[PDB]
Design an enzyme around this catalytic site. Structure first.
Site, PDB file in Angstrom:
ATOM      1  N   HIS B 293     -27.851 -58.248 -44.433  1.00  0.00           N
ATOM      2  CA  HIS B 293     -26.854 -59.217 -43.998  1.00  0.00           C
ATOM      3  C   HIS B 293     -26.480 -60.123 -45.164  1.00  0.00           C
ATOM      4  O   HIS B 293     -27.348 -60.835 -45.686  1.00  0.00           O
ATOM      5  CB  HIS B 293     -27.368 -60.058 -42.839  1.00  0.00           C
ATOM      6  CG  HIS B 293     -26.452 -61.185 -42.481  1.00  0.00           C
ATOM      7  ND1 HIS B 293     -25.224 -60.982 -41.887  1.00  0.00           N
ATOM      8  CD2 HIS B 293     -26.568 -62.521 -42.663  1.00  0.00           C
ATOM      9  CE1 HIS B 293     -24.630 -62.148 -41.704  1.00  0.00           C
ATOM     10  NE2 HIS B 293     -25.422 -63.098 -42.168  1.00  0.00           N
ATOM     11  N   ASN B 326     -18.303 -63.282 -44.806  1.00  0.00           N
ATOM     12  CA  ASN B 326     -19.410 -63.304 -43.851  1.00  0.00           C
ATOM     13  C   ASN B 326     -18.833 -63.286 -42.439  1.00  0.00           C
ATOM     14  O   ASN B 326     -18.366 -64.308 -41.932  1.00  0.00           O
ATOM     15  CB  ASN B 326     -20.280 -64.535 -44.082  1.00  0.00           C
ATOM     16  CG  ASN B 326     -21.555 -64.518 -43.265  1.00  0.00           C
ATOM     17  OD1 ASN B 326     -21.622 -63.905 -42.197  1.00  0.00           O
ATOM     18  ND2 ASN B 326     -22.569 -65.227 -43.746  1.00  0.00           N
TER      19      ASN B 326
HETATM   20  C1  LIG Z   1     -27.138 -72.792 -54.715  1.00  0.00           C
HETATM   21  C2  LIG Z   1     -26.805 -71.413 -54.207  1.00  0.00           C
HETATM   22  C3  LIG Z   1     -25.364 -71.418 -53.735  1.00  0.00           C
HETATM   23  C4  LIG Z   1     -26.941 -70.382 -55.308  1.00  0.00           C
HETATM   24  O1  LIG Z   1     -25.987 -70.634 -56.322  1.00  0.00           O
HETATM   25  P1  LIG Z   1     -24.472 -70.100 -56.376  1.00  0.00           P
HETATM   26  O2  LIG Z   1     -24.300 -69.194 -57.489  1.00  0.00           O
HETATM   27  O3  LIG Z   1     -24.276 -69.341 -55.063  1.00  0.00           O
HETATM   28  O4  LIG Z   1     -23.515 -71.373 -56.452  1.00  0.00           O
HETATM   29  P2  LIG Z   1     -23.946 -72.919 -56.940  1.00  0.00           P
HETATM   30  O5  LIG Z   1     -24.483 -72.779 -58.460  1.00  0.00           O
HETATM   31  O6  LIG Z   1     -24.944 -73.566 -56.079  1.00  0.00           O
HETATM   32  O7  LIG Z   1     -22.602 -73.802 -56.909  1.00  0.00           O
HETATM   33  C5  LIG Z   1     -22.129 -74.178 -55.631  1.00  0.00           C
HETATM   34  C6  LIG Z   1     -21.964 -75.703 -55.412  1.00  0.00           C
HETATM   35  O8  LIG Z   1     -22.221 -75.957 -54.005  1.00  0.00           O
HETATM   36  C7  LIG Z   1     -23.312 -76.796 -53.834  1.00  0.00           C
HETATM   37  N1  LIG Z   1     -24.095 -76.144 -52.759  1.00  0.00           N
HETATM   38  C8  LIG Z   1     -24.458 -74.887 -52.777  1.00  0.00           C
HETATM   39  N2  LIG Z   1     -25.154 -74.645 -51.696  1.00  0.00           N
HETATM   40  C9  LIG Z   1     -25.238 -75.754 -50.997  1.00  0.00           C
HETATM   41  C10 LIG Z   1     -25.819 -76.038 -49.837  1.00  0.00           C
HETATM   42  N3  LIG Z   1     -26.448 -75.069 -49.203  1.00  0.00           N
HETATM   43  N4  LIG Z   1     -25.767 -77.244 -49.334  1.00  0.00           N
HETATM   44  C11 LIG Z   1     -25.096 -78.210 -50.008  1.00  0.00           C
HETATM   45  N5  LIG Z   1     -24.501 -77.909 -51.189  1.00  0.00           N
HETATM   46  C12 LIG Z   1     -24.585 -76.681 -51.667  1.00  0.00           C
HETATM   47  C13 LIG Z   1     -24.055 -76.714 -55.165  1.00  0.00           C
HETATM   48  O9  LIG Z   1     -24.899 -77.843 -55.352  1.00  0.00           O
HETATM   49  C14 LIG Z   1     -22.924 -76.588 -56.171  1.00  0.00           C
HETATM   50  O10 LIG Z   1     -22.245 -77.822 -56.414  1.00  0.00           O
HETATM   51  P3  LIG Z   1     -21.738 -78.209 -57.878  1.00  0.00           P
HETATM   52  O11 LIG Z   1     -22.901 -77.758 -58.856  1.00  0.00           O
HETATM   53  O12 LIG Z   1     -20.424 -77.728 -58.297  1.00  0.00           O
HETATM   54  O13 LIG Z   1     -21.864 -79.761 -57.823  1.00  0.00           O
HETATM   55  C15 LIG Z   1     -27.789 -71.074 -53.088  1.00  0.00           C
HETATM   56  O14 LIG Z   1     -29.119 -71.536 -53.376  1.00  0.00           O
HETATM   57  C16 LIG Z   1     -27.381 -71.603 -51.745  1.00  0.00           C
HETATM   58  O15 LIG Z   1     -28.001 -72.521 -51.230  1.00  0.00           O
HETATM   59  N6  LIG Z   1     -26.335 -70.931 -51.232  1.00  0.00           N
HETATM   60  C17 LIG Z   1     -25.710 -71.170 -49.912  1.00  0.00           C
HETATM   61  C18 LIG Z   1     -25.306 -69.832 -49.235  1.00  0.00           C
HETATM   62  C19 LIG Z   1     -26.068 -69.577 -47.943  1.00  0.00           C
HETATM   63  O16 LIG Z   1     -27.270 -69.564 -47.927  1.00  0.00           O
HETATM   64  N7  LIG Z   1     -25.379 -69.371 -46.871  1.00  0.00           N
HETATM   65  C20 LIG Z   1     -26.021 -69.101 -45.584  1.00  0.00           C
HETATM   66  C21 LIG Z   1     -24.975 -68.764 -44.512  1.00  0.00           C
HETATM   67  S1  LIG Z   1     -25.757 -68.531 -42.903  1.00  0.00           S
HETATM   68  C22 LIG Z   1     -25.167 -67.135 -42.139  1.00  0.00           C
HETATM   69  O17 LIG Z   1     -25.119 -66.034 -42.636  1.00  0.00           O
HETATM   70  C23 LIG Z   1     -24.616 -67.348 -40.733  1.00  0.00           C
HETATM   71  C24 LIG Z   1     -25.571 -67.542 -39.555  1.00  0.00           C
HETATM   72  O18 LIG Z   1     -26.739 -67.325 -39.681  1.00  0.00           O
HETATM   73  C25 LIG Z   1     -25.047 -68.029 -38.195  1.00  0.00           C
HETATM   74  C26 LIG Z   1     -23.569 -67.817 -37.818  1.00  0.00           C
HETATM   75  O19 LIG Z   1     -22.664 -68.227 -38.507  1.00  0.00           O
HETATM   76  O20 LIG Z   1     -23.353 -67.273 -36.784  1.00  0.00           O
END
Ligand SMILES: CC(C)(COP(=O)(O)OP(=O)(O)OC[C@H]1O[C@@H](n2cnc3c(N)ncnc32)[C@H](O)[C@@H]1OP(=O)(O)O)[C@@H](O)C(=O)NCCC(=O)NCCSC(=O)CC(=O)CC(=O)O
Ligand SMILES: *[C@@H](C(=O)CC(=O)O)C(=O)SCCNC(=O)CCNC(=O)[C@H](O)C(C)(C)COP(=O)(O)OP(=O)(O)OC[C@H]1O[C@@H](n2cnc3c(N)ncnc32)[C@H](O)[C@@H]1OP(=O)(O)O
Lengths: 376, 379
Positions: B293, B326
């Site tokens: 997923h 997604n």
């Molecule tokens: C950090 C990384 C993105 C890996 O890195 P990346 O290469 O992906 O990008 P990045 O270097 O972080 O840059 C992106 C900019 O966004 C900020 N930022 C990223 N993440 C978050 C966050 N979480 N909170 C708050 N701020 C965030 C970050 O600080 C930076 O800001 P800036 O640096 O520009 O200030 C990863 O750890 C992470 O948490 N990924 C989130 C993806 C994820 O988990 N999705 C789950 C979906 S759930 C699903 O599927 C559906 C269901 O279950 C139910 C249903 O719907 O039905």
């Protein structure tokens, strides 16, 4: 490996309850609607005809005072309903489940599957997850979360648990139906008099059963056997019975055609379920009927020609609890077993061998479950 | 080992809304249509997020005309559940019907032979549900046995396989139509400097539906099995609700997802793999074909790195992420289809890239993890 068995039944209700005789006064007083005299008299007549004596309710006067939007008819209210229900529904399910596990007398860590069923609130992760936490079960319990199903879903849960138990050697299924009228409680309105019906009907409660195949000799005591389970619906049933989740909470659409249509259609479900077993005399069975309203109970009795006492257990639950949606039939199961013990009868089904559980709900969906009793 | 044996995936079909938006131009579209172009720094942050999603396009039920006719959808918090419901209660069954028609077309058996229907979505709820509506839309009979799975989340694709396996194996002759239909319209909202993390959701989620036919004991010369559901197990990471949760409010669906989520998921998938595959004597994760997923690109990369997978193992997963975003519970089923199609394009001998055994792994709210062991079929 043989048929799925009901191995235990437990029930639970909120501590707070209200008697129906004094409910018109309480309802019109707490919703600040005492100036609507004619509407209040109509509600008195409705409550008097429900054949309900008390209902248990999560919503107290204190909660209504803290949240006046719950006392309106249409003001935004889903957020407070969710804040209440997302927490209270798993707890009520936990109480019912503890009683069921105590009857079952096996360790709760032996439970392999959990099915949780409700139409009162939704959340992610769901009430199944919360119940796992509250009961102290392990994360390896296989969960199924059944949201927003409705009144017919007791039969649905039996239908599902049958397949879960019969296809997984050793599986033990905790099934929980937990319901609260707090999702649809609202003040009265002369523009929407039919909603008063709902305000007179629905109560709160949770039921839990343990389902499993191949019972352990001298340790487990089967209560009923799930012989078969089948669902159908009456075409165009959504035009007669439907409920929508809105910013005002759960709405209620129920035409006067519903009781006669259900009663009209139950005999073909009975025939389809019982002809392969060679049964055609509906009075040779014990009965569990979803008491969607007293009118439906009476009309099924009259349409099928049932002896008046067949639906006694059904009426008892209605009288003591009102319409608790999907939980009702499970309550009635317990009652028909308890009643059987009080009367000194030899099986859990009023001394009879075969019985039928019939439930119905939104869309004129009908669930038909054939049951077999067990030694008392 | 028996022919009256395990549940089989007998057909897969997919469908998306016709309207689509490219991810490269999505920051401009999003901040223009929500009247938020004065938020320059927030728009730049959203550009960086969209650039990191590894998504190229998403299909959308929401059009510009619908957004302009309903400005509450373009706010962050104004009451909006009613219009979302008016859209979704009607559109989700139709999309599910399109996917189902494609699946039934591959299946090539008469639709009146379908005995069970399982419908799965987190985009709106109603009573009677989308399953009832789909029965009406497809012209099936009222005697189809229905199960309506509302408000499940991202992992529910695995859940549906877990459910269909039992329905098929315990009911002789049963044929189960399983439908996962999802739309980001339940959680679409305007941006807010007070709630920057919600931007993540606004960059991730797309719309789509997948349908499969599941059954045991395939008819020789009539049905052509695609996959076999060997086993299915669910678990969750304790305290997972603190890291991933979504609540249905008057403002629609909210989104809580901490930065801990991808590393925790990647940390926990190997114990699921071991628990599911040790009874089969499998320990080399690269001997499997893979369906993951794609909750986000970070999770795909971190699972690849933690498990030591060859870079091409998750190609089908990445393809679906790139072309659709997604789509919540539908994603893995899309990927199933893709991994089969890719296998044909590469000239491989099984529907699982020429391999015998595979794994489908999904995850969602509560850090729930579903693990499905699959067996391929001759191409
Ligand atoms: C950090 C990384 C993105 C890996 O890195 P990346 O290469 O992906 O990008 P990045 O270097 O972080 O840059 C992106 C900019 O966004 C900020 N930022 C990223 N993440 C978050 C966050 N979480 N909170 C708050 N701020 C965030 C970050 O600080 C930076 O800001 P800036 O640096 O520009 O200030 C990863 O750890 C992470 O948490 N990924 C989130 C993806 C994820 O988990 N999705 C789950 C979906 S759930 C699903 O599927 C559906 C269901 O279950 C139910 C249903 O719907 O039905
Ligand atoms: C739950 C579910 O599935 C979903 C969930 O919660 O999860 C359910 O099972 S809901 C199904 C419940 N259905 C019903 O209760 C059927 C409602 N009853 C009727 O439609 C019938 O008309 C009755 C036979 C109940 C009416 O007559 P009754 O014998 O009870 O009493 P009478 O004097 O008519 O009636 C008293 C006053 O009631 C008014 N009234 C009854 N029913 C309705 C409906 N459905 N809509 C609006 N008004 C209704 C009558 O008009 C009568 O009025 P009066 O003021 O004295 O003239």
């Amino acid at each position: 490996e043989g048929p799925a068995l009901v191995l235990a039944i437990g029930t639970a209700t909120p501590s707070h309850w209200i008697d129906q005789s004094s409910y018109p006064d309480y309802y019109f007083r707490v919703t600040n609607s005492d100036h609507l005299v004619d509407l209040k008299e109509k509600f008195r007549r409705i409550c008097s005809r429900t054949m309900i004596k008390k209902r248990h309710m999560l919503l107290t006067e204190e909660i209504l005072k803290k949240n006046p939007n719950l006392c309106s008819f249409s003001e935004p209210s889903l957020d407070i309903r969710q804040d209440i229900l997302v927490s209270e529904i798993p707890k009520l399910g936990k109480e019912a489940a503890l009683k069921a596990i105590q009857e079952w007398a096996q360790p709760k860590s032996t439970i392999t599957h959990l099915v949780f069923c409700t139409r009162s609130g939704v959340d992610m992760p769901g009430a199944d997850y919360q119940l796992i936490k509250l009961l102290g079960l392990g994360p390896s319990v296989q969960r199924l979360m059944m949201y927003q199903q409705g009144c017919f879903a007791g039969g649905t849960m039996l239908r599902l648990a049958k397949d879960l138990a019969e296809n997984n050697k050793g599986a033990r299924i905790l099934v929980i139906c937990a319901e609260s009228s707090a999702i649809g409680f609202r003040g009265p309105s002369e523009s929407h008099v039919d909603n008063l019906v709902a305000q007179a009907l629905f109560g709160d409660g949770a039921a839990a059963i343990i389902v499993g195949s191949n019972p352990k000799p001298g340790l487990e005591k089967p209560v009923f056997e799930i012989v078969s389970a089948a669902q159908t619906f009456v075409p165009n049933g959504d035009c007669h019975l439907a409920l929508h989740l809105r910013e005002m909470g759960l709405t209620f659409h129920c035409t006067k055609d519903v009781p006669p249509t259900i009663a009209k259609n139950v005999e073909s479900c009975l025939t389809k379920a019982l002809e392969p077993l060679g049964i055609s005399d509906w009075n040779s069975l014990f009965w569990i009927l979803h008491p969607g309203g007293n009118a439906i109970v009476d009309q099924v009795e009259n349409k099928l020609g049932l002896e008046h006492e067949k639906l006694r257990a059904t009426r008892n639950i209605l009288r003591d609890f009102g319409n608790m949606s999907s939980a009702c039939v499970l309550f009635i199961l317990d009652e028909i077993r308890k009643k059987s013990a009080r009367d000194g009868l030899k099986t859990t089904g009023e001394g009879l061998d075969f019985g039928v559980l019939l439930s119905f709900g939104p869309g004129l969906t009908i669930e038909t479950v054939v049951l077999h009793s067990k030694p008392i």
